[PDB]
Design a protein around this nucleic acid. Structure first.
Lengths: 99, 99, 83, 208
RNA sequence: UGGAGAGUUUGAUCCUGGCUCAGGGUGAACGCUGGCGGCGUGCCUAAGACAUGCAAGUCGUGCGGGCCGCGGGAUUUUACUCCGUGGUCAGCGGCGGACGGGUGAGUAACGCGUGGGUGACCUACCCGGAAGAGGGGGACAACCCGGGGAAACUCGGGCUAAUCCCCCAUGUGGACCCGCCCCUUGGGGUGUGUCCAAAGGGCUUUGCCCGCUUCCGGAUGGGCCCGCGUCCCAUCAGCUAGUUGGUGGGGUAAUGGCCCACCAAGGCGACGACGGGUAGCCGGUCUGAGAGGAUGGCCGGCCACAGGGGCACUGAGACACGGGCCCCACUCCUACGGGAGGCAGCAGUUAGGAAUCUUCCGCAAUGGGCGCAAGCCUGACGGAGCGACGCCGCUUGGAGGAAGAAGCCCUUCGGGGUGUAAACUCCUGAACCCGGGACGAAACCCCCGACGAGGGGACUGACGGUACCGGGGUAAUAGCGCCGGCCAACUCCGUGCCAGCAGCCGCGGUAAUACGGAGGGCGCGAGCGUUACCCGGAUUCACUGGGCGUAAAGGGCGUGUAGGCGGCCUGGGGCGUCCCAUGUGAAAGA
């Protein structure tokens, strides 16, 4: 009356934590980024978006946010950043965006 | 092949959408007589380009809505607000049909 | 992972196998992708083994590990014999 | 199984001489020589106009009771016929004739089908050398129906071959008498048999 | 290659018409009876409750330890310590626990079936190709030390390894924004910008093996969408607020009111919406000449469920039967604070029931998981057990044997029957005894070769001392239904509208072929009957194939809504219709 592979459960809890973690940081950065754009910032706006981008792709490496679920959030970020930026002036810093 | 059907537009009182009436006919499975039968389809019209009475081709498509599953291919002939008239009559027939 | 393997037909004490390709997760005598031969372990007919050996080579070519005993038989009809 | 019990009693009842004892149901009493009427108290009483049913029934009972066979078994063969290519009526007779337990009889190794059966059940007989013990074994053309060289010396086998020493046999059966073996040339044709039975009625009994 | 009809309304007839019977079938059960074997098959009811045992693991060739051992080292002093090796125990880490197995509760629906879509997608392991793996850092169990609880378990502190986690690097390549090109729904290509890799382990250690990373493809498996088809009641006629559409977001692998904010006012219905009842669907099965009806057990495919209801986490895959969380009902533990559990896996128990099996053997085979391998796991499976539950084969003898024993049954008193039946003579020899004795099993593995091809060798059988072969050998089981007509088979007693029979028509009131019995006979035979249910006959829902003056059946009559139906000639279109080719129609079944 004890399936020693109830450690399967134990592990799920660790991974749960790791995932939730990486993700929760992706979010906080993405929001922090589009906020700077919506405030019409140039450097730091992209600089954080670039950080976020990284963290997404990095998370994609494993089981957290795998695939192209990754790609989505990337697509939505650059889309949302650039547009928000062009709703005001100065598009500066090479950053993550194409020329 | 995406099934391509052709019917009559019997409503454009929706945004970017037309109700199309496709009629079909066949040898009755048991009794032989060729019976007619018909089905309205909600068809996708991005340019509100079609109106009441146009006879339109209609194509099996990527889902747009719960129940929008077809886009309007080409237009076959304008006019034909007789067919429209016949649908409208059958409808208010049902009015004088309750208790 | 798809497998060349044996499915069991015949009756009780009357084994008769069917050399089949199939996804590994399917039942033994479940649905299969293709029959590519048969085999009578009791050799009661003068023809108790047969293999479409072109097809055998196809399924290998697209990657399909044979059961260890299903490959034994494929060998017998020279699926792997070259030159 | 089979039938069990009084045989040259149905010799009677059917009203036609049945050979079911072989040697005696053949020689100044199959009782058809003495009392050729049906058995029991009401035997030699006035018949009544028999029914279109009664008629088809007895004819079947006639045909079957000849070959000594189970109704269940009989009827399988019949249906097994019909759907098979060609004239049902004959073919049935053919298949009945192709039963070992009867070929053995037809081929002289025994005097009755009943006794012929027992020889099969006790492995005294072979088909193409291999010993066969099924009275139902369907003999096809070319088969050789041997006596068990092991059983050759029985008083019954000897005596019952010495009778067919001169005797002629079936236009579809060969017979080497001394090496105690015979052949199944071909299925007989309705006319090959003088069966005291109308097969068309037997078809009808199984139609209603 | 295929079609049978009969009884019964009348004093008699023709017709209408119902009822009824002859046939086939079943996961059956019940009665009397019951010898052998083979292959099938066996909770249809309470998706009620479940004792006990087994049913999912595995890898030391990813890593560090605890406990029990053995051996060898540093010292010539044996306390302390380095190395090697064997058990064993969990832990970390990986792959598998989403397969296999069970059940039909729910579901009238894209659930299924069938044909298509995906420019709207995913796929671990397997195959093929291209290119890689350079540095550094970190933690948590185990172990050790505490504390709380009766228990289940739990909180804290400290040490540590890795194929565990992270950072930097290289970017074959890929992701994302933008621009352009092809192509046309989000498909392929290219250019600046950004962003993203990796793990090591084993040796027959410099050359291989098992792995790792990124990418394109292949194979397999899936998600989603659409056309058609899919039971009963209209004594259910009107339904609808995420409702129908839009714009923008969220979410997913991906489309989508799937979800949210906001705008529009839609969407569905007699071609039957909404509502109620019932039900898993199919391949197919039974029946029918056929069309059709009925059905979906066993086997195969799909689906749905895992005490009842929600829910999410892990992960290639689940919203997971033997994983997790909460509510409910229930059962046990309880120091009353709190805990544990979930056979619709295999067996078995109990309850309901007219009724449904062994708490069996084996992993030998096939198949699945993990493993380089040896192997370990597998109530999938392969087998044996029980039950005439079904199908098939076989047995209870064979040949002789009286003008015919006895007994019993009739009898017109001579006779007739059971009956070649027995007794009795010969012959074979199911059972049973002894002897021998399988196929199912040659692979993985080792050696040779090159871990390839090819060649060589070794191990292994549950069933089982069964099948089958050879020798010996005993005359060795028969029942059940029926006999008025339909329908095959008749006499005598008993009984007197009694007792009783009866599928329908009808039998019994002192001569009953109909009741009960005996003799006899008919029909089947290890079965025969019975009851229930399905098709048939029933052209008795009639499409094939019916009808309405009086038999049941013309609306009390009109007007005309939708709907059905449409004169003669010509031309266009080719939707119905027809023809050719082609794809599909899995397997099993027939």
């Amino acid at each position: 009356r004890n399936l020693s592979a109830l450690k399967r459960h134990r592990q799920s809890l660790k991974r749960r934590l790791r995932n939730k973690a990486k993700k929760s940081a992706i979010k906080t950065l993405s929001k922090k980024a589009i906020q700077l754009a919506q405030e019409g910032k140039a450097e730091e706006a992209l600089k954080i978006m670039r950080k976020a981008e990284s963290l997404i792709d990095k998370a994609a490496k494993g089981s957290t946010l795998h695939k192209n679920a990754a790609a989505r959030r990337k697509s939505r970020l650059m889309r949302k950043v650039r547009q928000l930026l062009e709703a005001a002036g100065a598009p500066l810093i090479g950053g993550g965006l194409s020329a | 092949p995406k099934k391509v059907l052709t019917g009559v537009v019997v409503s454009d009182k929706m945004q970017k959408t037309v109700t199309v009436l496709v009629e079909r006919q066949f040898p009755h499975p048991l009794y032989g007589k060729v019976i007619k039968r018909s089905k309205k389809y909600l068809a996708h019209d991005p340019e509100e380009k079609y109106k009441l009475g146009d006879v339109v081709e209609i194509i099996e498509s990527r889902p747009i809505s719960k129940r929008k599953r077809f886009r309007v291919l080409r237009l076959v002939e304008s006019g034909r607000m007789d067919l429209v008239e016949k649908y409208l009559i059958r409808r208010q027939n049902y009015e004088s049909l309750s208790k | 992972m798809v497998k060349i393997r044996l499915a069991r037909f015949g009756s009780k004490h009357n084994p008769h196998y069917r050399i089949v390709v199939t996804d590994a997760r399917r039942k033994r005598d479940g649905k299969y992708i293709e029959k590519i031969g048969y085999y009578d372990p009791r050799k009661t007919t003068p023809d108790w083994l047969k293999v479409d050996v072109e097809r055998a080579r196809y399924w290998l070519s697209v990657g399909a590990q044979p059961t260890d005993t299903a490959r034994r038989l494929l060998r017998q009809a020279g699926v792997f014999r070259q030159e | 199984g089979r039938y069990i019990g009084p045989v040259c009693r149905l010799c009677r009842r059917e009203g036609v001489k049945l050979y079911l004892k072989g040697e005696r149901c053949y020689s100044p009493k199959c009782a058809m020589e003495r009392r050729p009427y049906p058995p029991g108290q009401h035997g030699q009483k006035r018949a009544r106009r028999p029914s279109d049913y009664a008629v088809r029934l007895r004819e079947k009972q006639k045909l079957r009771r000849i070959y000594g066979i189970s109704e269940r078994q009989f009827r399988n063969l019949f249906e097994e016929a019909s759907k098979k290519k060609g004239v049902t009526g004959s073919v049935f007779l053919g298949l009945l004739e192709s039963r070992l337990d009867n070929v053995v009889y037809r081929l002289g190794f025994a005097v009755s089908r009943r006794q012929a059966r027992q020889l099969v059940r006790h492995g005294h007989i072979t088909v193409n050398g291999r010993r066969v013990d099924l009275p139902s074994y369907r003999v096809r053309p070319g088969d050789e129906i041997a006596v068990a060289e092991k059983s050759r010396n029985l008083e019954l086998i000897r005596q019952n071959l010495e009778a067919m020493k001169g005797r002629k046999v079936g236009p579809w059966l060969s017979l080497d008498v001394e090496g105690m073996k015979g052949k199944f040339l071909r299925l007989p044709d309705r006319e090959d048999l003088a069966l005291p039975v109308n097969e068309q009625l037997v078809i009808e009994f199984y139609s209603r």
